[PDB]
Amino acid sequence: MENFQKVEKIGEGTYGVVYKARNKLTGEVVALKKIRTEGVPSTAIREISLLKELNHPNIVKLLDVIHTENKLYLVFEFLHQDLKKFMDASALTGIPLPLIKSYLFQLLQGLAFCHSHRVLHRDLKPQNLLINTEGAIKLADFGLARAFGVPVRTYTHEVVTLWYRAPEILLGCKYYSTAVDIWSLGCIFAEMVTRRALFPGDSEIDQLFRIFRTLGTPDEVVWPGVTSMPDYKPSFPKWARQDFSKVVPPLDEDGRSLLSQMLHYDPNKRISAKAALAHPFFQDVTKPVPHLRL
Ligand SMILES: C=CCNc1nc(N)c(C(=O)c2cccc([N+](=O)[O-])c2)s1
Numbered sequence: 001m002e003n004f005q006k007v008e009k010i011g012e013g014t015y016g017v018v019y020k021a022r023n024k025l026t027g028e029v030v031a032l033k034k035i036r037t038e039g040v041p042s043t044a045i046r047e048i049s050l051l052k053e054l055n056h057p058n059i060v061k062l063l064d065v066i067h068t069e070n071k072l073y074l075v076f077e078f079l080h081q082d083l084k085k086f087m088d089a090s091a092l093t094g095i096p097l098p099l100i101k102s103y104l105f106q107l108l109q110g111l112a113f114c115h116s117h118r119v120l121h122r123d124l125k126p127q128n129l130l131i132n133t134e135g136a137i138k139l140a141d142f143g144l145a146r147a148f149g150v151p152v153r154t155y156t157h158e159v160v161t162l163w164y165r166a167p168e169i170l171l172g173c174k175y176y177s178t179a180v181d182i183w184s185l186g187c188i189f190a191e192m193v194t195r196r197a198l199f200p201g202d203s204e205i206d207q208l209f210r211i212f213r214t215l216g217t218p219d220e221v222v223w224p225g226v227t228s229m230p231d232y233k234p235s236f237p238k239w240a241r242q243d244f245s246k247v248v249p250p251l252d253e254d255g256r257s258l259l260s261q262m263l264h265y266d267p268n269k270r271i272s273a274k275a276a277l278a279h280p281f282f283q284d285v286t287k288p289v290p291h292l293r294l
Contacts, residue, residue, distance in 0.1 A: 112272075183270065
């Protein structure tokens with residue numbers, strides 16, 4: 001490219017292909033994301049550009065928004081490995097508890113920061129949580145969903161993971177809140193602990209029913225207004241809530257209580273990132289260094 005040198009394709013992102021690139025004039029290595037047509041919405045460019053101002057140790061920095069030759073690219077700081085790969089790599093022994101606790105703590109800090117700045121992510125998943133050799137973890141892509149109009153599927157004819165989608169989204173609610181990110185993070189927390197996805201749905205209804213079979217089919221008592229959600233159906237099977245100690249064994253009671261507050265059905269009852277940072281679970285949090293194979 002005119003201003004970069006491709007090092008390799010890193011993967012397929014929500015909004016387009018992502019490459020590990022080298023800046024032609026600086027020599028710096030970055031994550032270059034090509035945004036997948038109409039004419040590159042102007043509202044999106046202005047809105048995304050505002051995100052360049054976000055700076056926090058737990059948020060992947062957006063270095064630039066490049067609009068040239070009528071194509072759009074997002075330039076991000078390049079991190080060492082993603083949480084999906086790290087979890088896969090730690091499958092045999094599992095991620096040590098102190099490291100799980102540290103990552104969760106840092107992710108909540110990133111969420112608290114973004115949410116305090118009126119920015120939501122809406123699509124948190126292991127793939128956009130990036131780690132480095134020093135023990136930090138950062139969230140990438142905050143604010144892109146609101147700015148863009150997340151297409152049903154990628155122009156790559158691939159597949160979109162639904163595993164971390166909040167129930168209000170699955171029920172067709174078109175108004176998002178900070179709670180959708182707490183739900184996703186809760187799902188990720190459970191996955192780090194058990195070494196298996198909490199709700200690995202293969203479709204939206206399967207995703208929804210997997211949640212119902214574990215936490216119980218929601219009703220007006222635990223979630224006022226649920227029966228009026230866009231895609232709610234009175235014909236949904238009525239599953240009883242499962243013993244929560246069966247959900248994420250063998251995590252201790254502080255971890256289980258915090259997780260239960262991150263997974264409340266009613267977005268309004270779901271714990272905020274700020275309040276979660278004060279939960280007793282983090283009383284002994286530290287910052288361990290991960291064993292990363294690059
Ligand atoms: C995976 C480690 C390489 N270093 C990276 N560094 C960054 N900043 C990456 C990303 O922001 C990212 C986020 C979601 C999906 C993909 N993606 O390529 O599909 C890439 S990836």
